[PDB]
């Protein structure tokens, strides 16, 4: 026969975990999608020689677009 199981309250831990997951995901799903879209459509730069008489900007010495920005 079904008896009652005396446990401490699980409402508050569960609510905390849902809130933490919610906020972390709220801002971290857009970042994951943005990094994917950048990596797929923009991509990294390719190594090239410095053309004659040309002087690159300081950010043009890095290959990843996010690091460059």
């Amino acid at each position: 026969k079904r008896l009652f199981i005396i446990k401490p309250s699980g409402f508050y831990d569960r609510r905390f975990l849902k809130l933490m997951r919610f906020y972390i995901l709220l801002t971290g799903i857009p970042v994951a999608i943005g990094i994917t879209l950048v990596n797929v459509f923009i991509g990294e730069a390719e190594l090239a020689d410095i053309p004659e008489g040309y002087v690159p900007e300081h950010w043009e010495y890095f290959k990843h677009p996010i690091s460059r920005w």
Binding site: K1, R2, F4
Partner: protein, 36 residues
């Protein structure tokens, strides 16, 4: 040898109370009233 009158009487009273408590720990046919 054995219990004293007060010992036996108190064990009987505590026994009745404990059995009522254990009986009332049972769930009714609807207890887990889950919300939608």
């Amino acid at each position: 040898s054995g219990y004293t009158p007060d010992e036996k009487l108190r064990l009987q009273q505590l026994r009745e109370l404990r059995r009522r408590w254990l009986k009332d720990q049972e769930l009714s046919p609807r207890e887990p009233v889950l919300p939608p």
